[PDB]
């Protein structure tokens, strides 16, 4: 069929819809409340002790950065994927641990301070040295340098939005821990309201429900990536002589990856008419692994009660 661009197109209003800005600000507010309420149940002693012992941090970074990009490249080469799809899956693989994974860590309820220090150190390491590995692993694809194409202001903004609410929570609990219940209830109700609002808004904001036109093997590998990541993290944690409570959160952090930076780099690198359904690939992909995480949650409820 030679080489032709996809018929999918984005309206010009997509650049500056007020609804897009509303969606961005409500997600920022949601994440701020998530992080505040999530750090409201954390203490400084455990995070200091885990910072003193970067053993789990070291193994987490080794699994996420020294192995995950390599296996992502291997799967991309094996699946005979196109240049755009291979670049997208490589960027997803080299992406650091997503914030939502910490939420899933709350479901794990094991060594939460280790989880937060691991994810912040992973984001710092990403900001420090992601472009070099991205350029090394993308030989023959996108011959451009791409070094300046990766976002930097977004990474530091995310780092601030992670550190500030957690630090505020630790300070408030250490000094004056007397208003836990009201803050928790308000956070929960506002979180539910914002979730309902975003669920209502995104359905009409996305549009063009042609996400099923994607080729089957790309969907298969997008589903396999979180599974293989979780399996590799669990195996590395178990074979390295780590206790069970301290390994589930590390495995879940390693398996989950952020997709916002991948979306931003995909949109800045390529026009939206050139990209077909892959523009909707990351937003669904994380959702997919969320469901996968839910399955793991069931497995947890198959072990804690039994």
């Amino acid at each position: 069929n030679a080489s032709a661009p996809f018929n999918f197109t984005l309206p010009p209003n997509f650049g500056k819809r007020p609804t897009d800005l509303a969606l961005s600000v409500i997600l920022v507010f949601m994440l701020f409340f998530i992080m505040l309420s999530l750090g409201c149940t954390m203490e400084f002693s455990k995070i200091k002790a885990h910072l003193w012992k970067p053993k789990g941090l070291a193994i987490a970074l080794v699994a996420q950065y020294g192995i995950m990009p390599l296996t992502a490249f291997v799967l991309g080469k094996v699946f005979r994927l196109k240049n755009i799809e291979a670049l997208a899956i490589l960027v997803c693989g080299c992406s650091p641990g997503g914030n939502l994974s910490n939420v899933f860590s709350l479901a794990m309820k094991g060594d939460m301070n280790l989880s937060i220090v691991m994810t912040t150190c992973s984001t710092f390491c990403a900001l420090g040295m992601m472009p070099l590995l991205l350029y090394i692993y993308s030989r023959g694809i996108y011959d451009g340098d791409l070094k300046d194409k990766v976002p930097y202001k977004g990474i530091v903004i995310s780092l601030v939005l992670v550190l500030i609410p957690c630090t505020i929570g630790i300070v408030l609990k250490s000094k004056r821990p007397q208003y836990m219940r009201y803050v928790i209830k308000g956070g929960m109700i506002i979180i539910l309201l914002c979730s309902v609002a975003v669920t209502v808004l995104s359905a009409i904001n996305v549009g063009k429900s042609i996400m099923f036109a994607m080729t089957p093997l790309l969907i298969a590998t997008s589903s396999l990536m979180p599974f293989i990541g979780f399996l590799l993290g669990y195996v590395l944690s178990a074979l390295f002589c780590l206790n069970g409570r301290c390994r589930r959160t590390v495995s879940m952090e390693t398996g989950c990856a952020n997709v916002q930076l991948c979306s931003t780099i995909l949109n800045v690198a390529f026009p939206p008419e050139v990209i077909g359904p892959l523009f909707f690939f990351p937003l669904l992909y994380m959702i997919f692994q969320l469901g996968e995480g839910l399955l793991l949650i069931a497995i947890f409820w198959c072990y804690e009660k039994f």
Partner: antibody, heavy 121, light 113 residues
């Protein structure tokens, strides 16, 4: 279909300061990238470099890295190529070609009619 | 870098004599991940802009005569015309785009006397 229009024949002094414009308005100009090919009389084609207008990215050959310069105009949907360094031997024919670019330029499916650049006294 | 060298560089065919232009390139310009075999065969009539004939070295552009066939793999490629007409006299460069855009020396077609 789509056609590519060149600026036209150019006769310039060895004082440089020459610019070549290629126009193509038959599609979405940001969906494809534009290459420039230099041909000497009876010596075959020679590649110079390409430009992607969406990100305003430019890549040049090793020989043409020093002199080659590519710019794009989305409003005019045009590609401008400049050297700023010419010699008497530099006279040639320059073609602008349109190609798809996912990770690697595929092929030059459409070409312009060509611009004959001459440098002399 | 990759450089293209064409062995014959000049031949003459009257009506139906085999042509079989071949350029061996430099190394294996075959993508392992994507089975595309990056290569392009162009046609440049005198006093005219080059016209694309074959892309991916196996598939021909729509609208060209079926007499233009291209078969090859790895480093060995061959373009055959078979029934050569009076309008088929041009220059072919077998341009490659695996790593860098480089053009071949060019082969000229004439008429035997």
């Amino acid at each position: 279909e789509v056609q590519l229009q060149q600026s036209g024949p150019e006769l310039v002094k060895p004082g440089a300061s020459v610019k070549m414009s290629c126009k193509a308005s038959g599609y979405t100009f940001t969906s494809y990238i534009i290459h420039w090919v230099k041909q000497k009389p009876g010596q075959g084609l020679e590649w110079i470099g390409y430009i992607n207008p969406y990100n305003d990215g430019t890549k040049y050959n090793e020989k043409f890295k020093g002199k080659g310069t590519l710019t794009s105009d989305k409003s005019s949907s045009t590609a401008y190529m400049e050297l700023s360094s010419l010699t008497s031997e530099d006279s040639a024919v320059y073609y602008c070609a349109r190609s798809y670019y996912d990770g690697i330029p595929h092929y030059f499916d459409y070409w312009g009619q060509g611009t004959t650049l001459t440098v002399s006294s | 870098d990759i450089v293209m060298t064409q062995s014959p560089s000049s031949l003459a065919v009257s009506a139906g004599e085999k042509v079989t232009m071949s350029c061996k390139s430099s190394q294996s310009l075959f993508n392992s991940r994507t089975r595309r075999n990056y290569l392009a065969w162009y046609q440049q009539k005198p006093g005219q802009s080059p016209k694309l004939l074959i892309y991916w070295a196996s598939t021909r552009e729509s609208g060209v005569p079926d007499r233009f066939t291209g078969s090859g793999s790895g480093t060995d490629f061959t373009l055959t015309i078979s029934s050569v007409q009076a309008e088929d006299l041009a220059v072919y460069y077998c341009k490659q785009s695996y790593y860098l855009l480089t053009f071949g020396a060019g082969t000229k077609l004439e008429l035997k006397r």
